[PDB]
Symmetry: C4
C-alpha cells in the first residue's frame, strides 16, 4: 500500500530531475576540486557537499531497490549506479580517484544518453569472436617478440607484458619505426620481417571487420525490405486470385441458368 | 526605382563582381606575407584593402536595404556581415582582429552556391551527433579529472591542470607520441599508467568509428524505406485499379445474369 | 598501311613491348647497386639505349596508325611524354630520375591495370568542389599561422609556403603536439585554439566526404533498382490491362448477342 | 596402405571422435600457457626441465595425430589448407632444436595458431576475412609497382647524402612504407631531407596522397560493389515474384476468356 505511495515518488519526474541536478552540481564540484587554489579556500564546503550528495545517492538507491526489488539488480544501469555509489562510500587511495566515476550516472539517469551507449555496445557481442582471435594473435607475437628481442632490448620486449604493451604501441603506429624497429635493426637487421606483417595483419582485420559490419548490416536491411515488398505482391496475388473465383463462378452461375434458357 | 537597385544587386554581374574582388583581395592577403614584397609594393596594398572594404560595406549595405530583415535571418549574410565589420574596426585595438580579418576569404564560400551547398551538406550531420559529442566531452572531462589527480603532481606539464589533462588527453586520442612521449614516462613513476590510457584509447576510437558506421547504416535504412514506400505504393495502385476493373466486370455479369 | 596496323594491334606487338617494360624494370632496379654498375654497368646502359629506341619505334608506329586519335588518348600521351623524357639528353639531372616513370607504362600497356586506375580515378571529379574548399581552408589558415607564428618560429611558419607545409603535417597528425604546438604554447599559450579547430575541421571534412560517397553511391543503386522493379510491375500492369479488354470486348460482344436472341 | 580395412576403420573412429578433437584442443591450450611461462626466467630456472619434456610430449602426440589424420583422409588431407598448416607447423617443431638457423625454435610458437584450425568458429572468422584478398591482388600489385617505382626514385635522389634511409633499394622501400604509416614522416625524414633538397616535399606529399587515396578508395569500392550485388540478389527475387504473378493472372484471365467464348459458342 505505502509501496505505491513512494513508488509514485521514486518514478516521478521530480525525483529523477532532482537527482540529475545533484549529479551535475557534484560534477562541477569535482572539477573545482582540481584547483589547488580552490581547495585552500572553499575546500571544506565541498567535502561536506560531497558527503551530502553521496548520502542522498544512498537514500535514492535504497528506495530504488525497495521499489524495484530484484529487478533492480537484473538491471545493468542500476548495478552501475549501485557500484559507483558504493565505491564512493568506502573510507577515504585509488578509490578516491574512481569516485569521479559517479559523473557517468549522468549517462545512466538520462535516457537520451542510455540510448547512445546501448546503440554503441550492440556491436560488441558479435565482435567477441574477432577480439579473441586478435588477442591470440597478440599473445603469440608477444611471446615471439620476447624470445627474439627481450635479450638485447629488455625495456621494450624483456617481459611478455612488455612485448604486449609494445606490440599494442606498434599497432597504434606510434614511433614504431624511428622509435622501435630502426633501433632493433641495428642489432637484428631482419626485424622488419616481424613487424611489417604484424602491422598488415592487424590493420587488415580491423578494417575488414568493420567493412563486414557495414555490408552485413546492409544485407539484413535489404531482407527486411525484400520481405515487406514480396509479402505485399503476395497479398495482392491472394486478393485478385480470390476475386477471380467470384468472377469465374459467375460464368458457372450465369452459364448454368443461361444454359437452360437456350 | 527600388527595382533598379534590387535588379542590380542580384544580377550575375553584381555577385560575379564581388566574387572578383574577393579573389583579388585574397591574393593581396597572400602577398602581404612577404617582407620583400611589402618593402616594395606595401603601401599600394593598404589602400587596395581599404578600398575593397569600402566596396564590401556598400555591398553589405545595399544587400541589407534590398533584403531588410531577411538579411539577418540568413546565416551566410550574417557571416558576410560579421566578417566585413571585423575589417572596419580600427586595426590598433586587440591585435587579434588584424588576423581574423583574413576570415573574409571564406566569403568566397558565401558568394558561390556550389560552395554553400558543400558546407551545408557537411553540416547536415552535426545535429544528430550532438548527443555523442556531449557523451565524448563528458568522457574526456571525467578522465581529465582522474588524470589530473593521478598524474598532475609528478607530471605538471601534462596533467598539472584540468585544462592540461584535457589537452594531453586529446593528444592521446590523436595517438601522437602517446607512448614514447607520455605513457612510457608516466610508467617510470606509476607502472600501472597503461591501465588508464589503453582503455581510454579503445573507448575513444570505438565511439568515433562506430558513430560513422551508424551514420552509414542508418542513412541506408532510410534509403531502403524511401524506396520501399515507392515500390509498395505502386503495387497498391496496381491492385485498386484491377479491383475497380474486376468490380466492374463482376458487376457486368450481374447485368447479363439478370437478362 | 594495313600491314603496320596488323602489327601494332597484334597481341605479339603489345605483349612484346610489355616484355621490354618488365625487363627494363629489373635492370632499372639493378642499376641501384653500386656493386652491379661497377661490373655490369656498361652492358645495362646499352640495354637502356636499346629499349628506348624500340619504344620510340613503337610510339612512332602507333602514331602513324592512329594519327590524331593517338594524341587524344591519355594512356598513349603518357607513353609519349614518358618515352620523350627518356630521350632528352641526361644533361640538371632531374630528368634522369623521371625516366623511371616509364615503368608506369606497365599500367598503360596492361588493360586490367588500366581498369583499376580508371575505377579509382573515377571518384575525383566530384571531389574537385571539396578539394577547392579544403585548399582554400588551408590557404586561409596558412596566412593566419604565418602572421601569428612566423616571427618567433621561422622554421615552421616564417613563410606562407612553410605554414602550408606545416599545416599539412598537422593534418597528418605527425608530431603535431610534442613537435609543434607545445613549443608554440611556450610563447603563445592560446595556440591550441588555432590548431585543435584546424584538426577537427580537416578530419571532419575528410571523413564525411567519404561517408557521402558511400551513401550517395548507395542511393543511386537504390534508384537504379526501383525503375527495374517498377518497370516490371508496370509491364505486369499493362499486359493485364489489355487482357481485360480482350475479356471486356468478348463480354460485350457476347452480352450484346444474347440480347438479340 | 590401409585403404578400407578393419584397422583403417579403427583409426577413423579415433580421428573423428569427440574425445580426439577435444583432447588435441586441450593440449594446444596447455602448451600455449606453457610457452607463456617459458618467457619467465624465474620459472625456467625452477620448472624448466618440466616444460621441455611437456613440449617434447605435446609435439609427439601432435605428430601422432597428424599421421592418423593422413591415414584417415589420404589426399583430401593435403587438398585441405587447414590440414596443411597443422602439418607445416608441426614439422617446424620437429626440426632439431639447435639447427643452423636457430630461429625455428621461435617459429615453433606458431603452432598456437593451431587453436584456430581446430575450432570451426575460428576457421569461419578467418575465412570471412580472407575472402576479400583475391579481388585486391590487382590493386595490391598496382601498389607494389608504385612503391618499387618510387623506391628507385628515392634511392637515386636521396641515398647518397642519406644512406641510412635511402642508400639501398631495400631501404627506400622500408622508409617509403614508414612514410605511408605517417610515422615521423616530416620531423623524422622529410624536414631533414629538405635541409639538403628543399623541394623534397614534391616527392613525398604526392606519395602520401596517392597511397592514401588508393587504400581508402579501394575499401569504398568493396563496400559499394559488395552492395550492388546485394541489390541484384534482391531485385531478382522481387522480379521473380512479380514475374510469376504475371504468369498466374495471365492464365487465369485466359482460362476465363475462353470460358466466355465457350458460352458464345453455345448461342452461335
Ligand atoms: C579549465 C581550466 O582552465 O583549468 C585550469 C584552472 C586554473 O587552475 P588554478 O589552480 O585554479 O589557477 C591557475 C593556475 N595556473 C595559473 C597555473 C593556470 O583550474 C580550474 O578552473 C578548475 C575548475 C574548472 C571547472
Ligand atoms: O598481461 C599483458 C600485459 C601486462 O603488462 P605488464 O607486465 O603488467 O606491464 C607493466 C610494466 N610496464 C609498465 C613496465 C610495462 O598487458 C599490459 O600491461 C598492456 C598491454 C595491452 C595489450 C592490448 C592488446 C589487446 C589486443 C586487442 C586487439 C583487438 C581489437 C580489435
Ligand atoms: C605473420 C608471420 C610472421 C612471421 C614472423 C617471422 C619472424 C622473423 C624473425 C626475425 O626477423 O628476427 C630477426 C632475428 C635476427 O637474428 P640474428 O641475425 O641471428 O642476430 C644474432 C645476434 N647477434 C647479432 C648478436 C649475433 O632473428 C633471425 O635470426 C631471423 C633471420 C632472418 C629470417
Ligand atoms: C569530442 C572531443 C572533445 C575533446 C575536446 C578536447 C579539448 C582540448 C583542450 O585543449 O581543452 C583545453 C581547455 C583549457 O585549456 P587551458 O586551461 O587554457 O591550458 C592548456 C594549454 N596550456 C597548457 C598551454 C595553457 O579545456
Ligand atoms: C584535401 C586537400 C588538402 C589541401 C591540400 C594539402 C596542402 C599541401 C600543401 C603543401 O604541400 O605545401 C608545400 C608547399 C611548399 O611551398 P614552399 O614554401 O616553396 O616550400 C619550401 C619550404 N621549405 C623550404 C621549408 C621546405 O606550400
Ligand atoms: C602496398 C604494398 C607496399 C608493400 C611495402 C612493403 C615494405 C617493403 C620493406 O619493408 O622493405 C624491406 C625489404 C628488405 O630490404 P633490406 O635492404 O634487407 O632492409 C632491411 C635491412 N635494413 C633495415 C638494414 C636496411 O625490401
Ligand atoms: C562477420 C563478422 C565476424 C564473423 C561479425 C562480427 C560482428 C558482427 C556484426 C555485429 O554483431 C553487429 C550485428 C549483430 C546482428 O545480430 C547481426 C548483424 C551484425 C551486423 C553482425 C554481422 C556479423 O556477424 C559480424 C560483422
Ligand atoms: C553477396 C555475395 C554472395 C553472392 C558475397 C560474395 C563475396 C562476399 C563478400 C566477401 O566475402 C568479402 C566480405 C566478407 C565479409 O564477411 C562481409 C563483406 C564482404 C565484402 C562479402 C559481402 C558479400 O557476402 C559477398 C559480396
Ligand atoms: C544513431 C546515432 C546516435 C545514437 C546518430 C548520430 C548521427 C545520426 C545520423 C545523422 O543525424 C545524419 C542522418 C540524419 C537523418 O535525419 C537521420 C539519419 C542520419 C544518418 C542519422 C542517424 C542517427 O540518428 C545517427 C547515426
Ligand atoms: C535492423 C536489424 C534488426 C531489425 C538490426 C539488428 C542489429 C543492428 C545493427 C547493430 O545494432 C549494430 C549497429 C548499431 C548502430 O547503432 C547502427 C548500425 C548497426 C550495424 C545496426 C544496424 C541494424 O539496426 C541492425 C542490423
Ligand atoms: C555530395 C558530394 C559533394 C558535397 C559529392 C563529392 C563526390 C561525389 C561522388 C563522386 O563524384 C563519385 C560519384 C559520381 C557520380 O556521378 C555520382 C555518384 C558519386 C558517388 C558522387 C556522389 C556525390 O556527388 C559526391 C559524394
Ligand atoms: C535520404 C534521407 C532522407 C531524405 C536524408 C536525410 C538526411 C541525409 C543525410 C544527411 O544530410 C547527412 C549526410 C549528408 C551527405 O551529403 C550525404 C550523406 C548524409 C548521411 C545524408 C544521407 C541522406 O541523404 C539523408 C539520410
Ligand atoms: C573494383 C575493385 C578493384 C578495381 C575490386 C577489388 C576488391 C573487389 C571486391 C572483393 O573481391 C570482394 C567481393 C568479391 C566478389 O566476388 C565480387 C564483389 C566484391 C565486393 C569485389 C568487388 C570488386 O571486384 C572489388 C572492390
Ligand atoms: C552505379 C553508377 C552508374 C549507373 C556508378 C556511377 C559512378 C559510380 C561510382 C564511382 O565510379 C566511384 C566509385 C568507383 C568504385 O570502383 C566503386 C564505387 C564508386 C562509388 C562507384 C559506384 C557506382 O559504380 C557508381 C555510382
Ligand atoms: Cl497484379
Amino acid at each position: 500500500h505505502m509501496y505505491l505511495r513512494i513508488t509514485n515518488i521514486v518514478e516521478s519526474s521530480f525525483f529523477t530531475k532532482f537527482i540529475i541536478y545533484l549529479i551535475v552540481l557534484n560534477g562541477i564540484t569535482m572539477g573545482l576540486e582540481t584547483s589547488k587554489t580552490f581547495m585552500q579556500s572553499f575546500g571544506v564546503y565541498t567535502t561536506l557537499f560531497n558527503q551530502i550528495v553521496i548520502t542522498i545517492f544512498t537514500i535514492e538507491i535504497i528506495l530504488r531497490i525497495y521499489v524495484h526489488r530484484i529487478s533492480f539488480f537484473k538491471d545493468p544501469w542500476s548495478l552501475f549506479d549501485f557500484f559507483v555509489v558504493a565505491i564512493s562510500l568506502v573510507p577515504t587511495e585509488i578509490l578516491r580517484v574512481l569516485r569521479v566515476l559517479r559523473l557517468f550516472r549522468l549517462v545512466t539517469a538520462v535516457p537520451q544518453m542510455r540510448k547512445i551507449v546501448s546503440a554503441l555496445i550492440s556491436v560488441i557481442p558479435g565482435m567477441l569472436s574477432v577480439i579473441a582471435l586478435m588477442t591470440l594473435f597478440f599473445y603469440i607475437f608477444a611471446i615471439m617478440a620476447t624470445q627474439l628481442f627481450g635479450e638485447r632490448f629488455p625495456e621494450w620486449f624483456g617481459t611478455l607484458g612488455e612485448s604486449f604493451y609494445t606490440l599494442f604501441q606498434v599497432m597504434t603506429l606510434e614511433s614504431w619505426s624511428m622509435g622501435i624497429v630502426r633501433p632493433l635493426m641495428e642489432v637484428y637487421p631482419y626485424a622488419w620481417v616481424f613487424f611489417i606483417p604484424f602491422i598488415f595483419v592487424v590493420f587488415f582485420v580491423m578494417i575488414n571487420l568493420y567493412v563486414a559490419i557495414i555490408v552485413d548490416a546492409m544485407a539484413i536491411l535489404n531482407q527486411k525490405e525484400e520481405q515487406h515488398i514480396i509479402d505485399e505482391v503476395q497479398s495482392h496475388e491472394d486478393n485478385i486470385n480470390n476475386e477471380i473465383i467470384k468472377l469465374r463462378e459467375e460464368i458457372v452461375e450465369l452459364k448454368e441458368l443461361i444454359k437452360t434458357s437456350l
